[PDB]
Amino acid sequence: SGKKFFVTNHERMPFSKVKALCSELRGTVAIPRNAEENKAIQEVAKTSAFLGITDEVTEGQFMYVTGGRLTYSNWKKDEPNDHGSGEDCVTIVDNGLWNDISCQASHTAVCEFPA
C-alpha cells in the first residue's frame, strides 16, 4: 500500500505543463498526504517541485487538484504569503517546507501513481 512518485528526465516546466505530463501518463501531480510522503517527494525530486495543491478558485484556500481541503500541510514560516501579483501554486523547497509561488515559474515535474 503506498503511492510512488515518478520523475522524468525533462527540464523544469510551469505548472500547466506538469499537469499535462502527469495526465498523459495517467497520474496526478504529486500530493503528500503526510510527512512520510512529503519526504518521499523530496527524495525523488531533489530540486524544488510542484505539488498538486493550489488556491486558484478561492485565494487563501488551498485545495488538492483532485478535490478536498488539506489534511496535511508543511508551510515554511510566513507562507502562504501570495507575494506581489499572486502566488497560486505550491512548491516543496528547502528541507521539504512548502512555499506558494507563481504557477508560471518552471519547476520539477513529479507525478504520483497508486500501490
Add this chain to the structure above:
Amino acid sequence: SGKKFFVTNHERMPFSKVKALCSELRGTVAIPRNAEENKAIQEVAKTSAFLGITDEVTEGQFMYVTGGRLTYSNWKKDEPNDHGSGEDCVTIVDNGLWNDISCQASHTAVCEFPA
C-alpha cells in the same frame, strides 16, 4: 532523449517487477537505441538500471523485449559472459557500460515513452 523521455521512481526491484511496473504505466522498460539515449538513461537512473534487452530465447543472442536483434550495444569489456548458471538480463553500470546479469537481481526501474 531526442525522441523519448524516461520515467523512474528510483526503486530497485527484479526484472519481472520492472517490466510489470512499466506495463502498468503503459510504457516499456527503457531501451537505449543509440549513444544519446544510453547517456540519457544513465543520467536519470543515476545508479544501475535494467534495460529492456534479454537473451532468454537464444542464449548468447540478445534481443529487445519489444522484439528484434540489437542495433546498438555498449558492452563492458568481456561482456556478455553468461556468468555462473546464466545471466540473461542487462543493466547499465558505470559510464553507461552494459553487463548481462541475473534477471533475479534488483536494480533501478526506468520506463520509456515516445516524446
